[PDB]
Amino acid sequence: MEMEKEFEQIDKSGSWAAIYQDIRHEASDFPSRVAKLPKNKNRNRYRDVSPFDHSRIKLHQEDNDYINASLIKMEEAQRSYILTQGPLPNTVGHFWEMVWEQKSRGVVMLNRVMEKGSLKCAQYWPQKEEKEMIFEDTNLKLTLISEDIKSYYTVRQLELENLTTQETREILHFHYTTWPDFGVPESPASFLNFLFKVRESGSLSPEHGPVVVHCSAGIGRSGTFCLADTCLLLMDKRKDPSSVDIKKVLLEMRKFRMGLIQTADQLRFSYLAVIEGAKFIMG
Numbered sequence: 001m002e003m004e005k006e007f008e009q010i011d012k013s014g015s016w017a018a019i020y021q022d023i024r025h026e027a028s029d030f031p032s033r034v035a036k037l038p039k040n041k042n043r044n045r046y047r048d049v050s051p052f053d054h055s056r057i058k059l060h061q062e063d064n065d066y067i068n069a070s071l072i073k074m075e076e077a078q079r080s081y082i083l084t085q086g087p088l089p090n091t092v093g094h095f096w097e098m099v100w101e102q103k104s105r106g107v108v109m110l111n112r113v114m115e116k117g118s119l120k121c122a123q124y125w126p127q128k129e130e131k132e133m134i135f136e137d138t139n140l141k142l143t144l145i146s147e148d149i150k151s152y153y154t155v156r157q158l159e160l161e162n163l164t165t166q167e168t169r170e171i172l173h174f175h176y177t178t179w180p181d182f183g184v185p186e187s188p189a190s191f192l193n194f195l196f197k198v199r200e201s202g203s204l205s206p207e208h209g210p211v212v213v214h215c216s217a218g219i220g221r222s223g224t225f226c227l228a229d230t231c232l233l234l235m236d237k238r239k240d241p242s243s244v245d246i247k248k249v250l251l252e253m254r255k256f257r258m259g260l261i262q263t264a265d266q267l268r269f270s271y272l273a274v275i276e277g278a279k280f281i282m283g
């Protein structure tokens with residue numbers, strides 16, 4: 001059923017809360033035993049948001065390999081994503097270790113450091129060129145190279161150095177700065193515009209490791225970003241762009257990380273973003 005018409009049918013019937021609970025009911029439940037070990041309590045931002053054991057990213061160290069991060073592998077679309085929480089004061093070194101070890105080119109940040117008067121993630125990148133950051137626990141150095149500030153987002157060029165080998169790599173930081181403190185954006189135009197720039201950078205392409213995507217918990221805004229990208233890529237590949245079922249793509253993604261799309265409003269916004277993107281994606 002053309003998602004356009006499915007959209008108008010749910011809107012006129014005001015059944016968004018009913019559709020959303022149906023997804024919550026059918027979603028996968030897999031064990032998260034490593035996340036719940038007592039040694040890992042200060043590595044989790046939220047007690048109720050954990051990576052599944054089968055899809056968790058492992059740090060390459062013998063001491064403690066745990067980080068709150070999941071590999072979302074979309075087989076038909078040929079795209080992979082790492083979805084993670086906003087880094088904590090004691091996991092900023094782990095965060096940059098993961099980017100290094102997974103060979104990522106891009107980091108996508110969908111939150112502000114402060115929202116609703118509370119801290120939603122650590123200040124984990126340098127704000128000035130001449131004041132670099134050293135992560136002593138993982139042996140990494142991070143330098144700000146350049147910053148491009150736009151009305152709806154900021155792009156930064158970062159240099160990550162493995163202090164053990166003196167290898168360096170260029171990481172691109174894509175920071176969506178205008179998601180409102182409550183609800184979702186009224187129009188998906190600026191979110192779609194931001195997505196286009198991520199792809200254009202090469203950050204989502206198979207020559208690199210998977211893109212790292214985060215918000216505060218790494219399931220809500222983060223879920224919306226990967227769901228929209230994957231649905232638009234499938235509409236480009238299929239002979240019948242009308243066979244793309246957004247609810248079925250979301251349940252596939254929820255096999256790899258719990259709780260993706262946190263509200264009925266985020267579900268409606270994901271439909272709007274894909275729907276608007278179709279007309280353009282259609283040539």
Ligand SMILES: CNC(=S)N(Cc1ccccc1)Cc1cccnc1
Pocket residue numbers: 188189190192193195196199232276277280281
């Ligand atoms: C309102 N912007 C839309 S719907 N875009 C389409 C799109 C397709 C796939 C992924 C992201 C975005 C972007 C764009 C940029 C420059 C000129 N036209 C369109």
